[PDB]
Design a protein around this ligand. Structure first.
Ligand SMILES: CN1C(=O)c2ccccc2NC(=O)/C1=C/c1ccc(C(F)(F)F)cc1
Ligand SMILES: [Fe+3]
Length: 287
């Protein structure tokens, strides 16, 4: 039983409902080839200069990812295609709003570009958020998902190069006795395609068996504004922040946030007013 494939043009309303039911879905043409081209162009350097996840020069090292992994967050100042294009995506926001309406506003927990080197071993099956948000394990089982992950293929995802393994229906599992690699299906995709999984879906990156292929992805974690992001955008230049849209500014934490409570008092407010009003932050300016 393979992962459902969907359209970013025709079947838009069916995407969240699918993930909801299966835990995963592939969105073909999630990003256009032109956008994926510029994204790669722009992040290429940073991917090569990034050190090991657990580098010694880091005060917040990551001991979970492997040495063959390279990750780059805080992509707003690096890429114009991310901050203008991806962040304002109508396919993304439709899915996000459909998924997180019960809770309210959402934002970006992380937007990272990940490049796996050749001979990169498979990861162990895991659920996201368990190394940053321990509170996600104390949620009831029927609680609607608090975060969803968009893994966008920046290059081909194949069986030889390590295409993601997913266990379907695993987001509705409490008992992890059936966790095994045999129960998984693959996510084959071309550049621009996106696998969409929730925070409770058991998945993993596969093994790179060729020795020559480099696999790259753009991973965007979206979550409710009630949870703290993994990455901070506090040091992003104001000129860059002021060149964004309001929606892009609020996704990055440069805005106040609301919740779905009927008489919501807000998040990140300053004596009744917004972050944006208080600092008189403009939008859509040039850089
Ligand atoms: C700790 N971790 C991340 O670092 C991470 C990396 C990129 C984007 C989101 C993200 N948040 C997570 O939940 C996460 C899961 C996770 C990653 C790798 C392995 C490995 F071990 F397998 F490698 C296991 C578990
Ligand atoms: Fe993961």
């Amino acid at each position: 039983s393979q992962i459902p494939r969907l359209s970013a043009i025709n079947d838009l309303h069916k995407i969240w409902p699918t993930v909801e039911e299966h835990g995963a879905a592939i969105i073909e043409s999630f990003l256009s080839l032109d956008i994926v081209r510029r994204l790669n162009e722009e992040v290429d350097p940073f991917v090569k200069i990034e050190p090991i996840p657990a580098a010694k020069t880091k005060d917040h090292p990551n001991h979970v990812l492997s040495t063959t992994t390279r990750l780059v967050n805080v992509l707003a100042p690096i890429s114009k295609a991310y901050r203008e294009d991806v962040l304002n995506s109508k396919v993304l926001h439709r899915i996000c709003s459909d998924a997180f309406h019960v809770y309210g506003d959402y934002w970006v927990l992380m937007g990272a570009v990940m490049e796996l080197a050749p001979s990169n071993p498979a990861q162990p099956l895991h659920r996201d958020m368990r190394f940053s948000h321990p509170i996600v394990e104390y949620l009831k089982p029927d609680a609607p998902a608090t975060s969803i992950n968009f893994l966008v293929a920046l290059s081909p995802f194949t069986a030889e190069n390590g295409a993601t393994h997913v266990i379907l229906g695993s987001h509705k599992w409490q008992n992890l006795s059936n966790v095994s690699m045999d129960a998984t299906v693959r996510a084959l995709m071309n550049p621009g395609d996106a696998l969409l999984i929730t925070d409770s879906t058991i998945h993993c990156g596969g093994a790179e068996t060729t020795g020559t292929e480099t696999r790259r992805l753009l991973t965007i974690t979206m979550g409710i504004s009630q949870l703290t992001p993994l990455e901070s955008n506090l040091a992003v230049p104001r000129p860059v922040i002021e060149s964004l849209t309001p929606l892009a500014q609020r996704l990055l934490g440069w805005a106040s946030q609301r919740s779905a409570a009927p008489r919501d008092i807000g998040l990140l407010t300053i004596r009744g007013n917004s972050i944006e009003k208080t600092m008189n932050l403009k939008a859509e300016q040039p850089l």
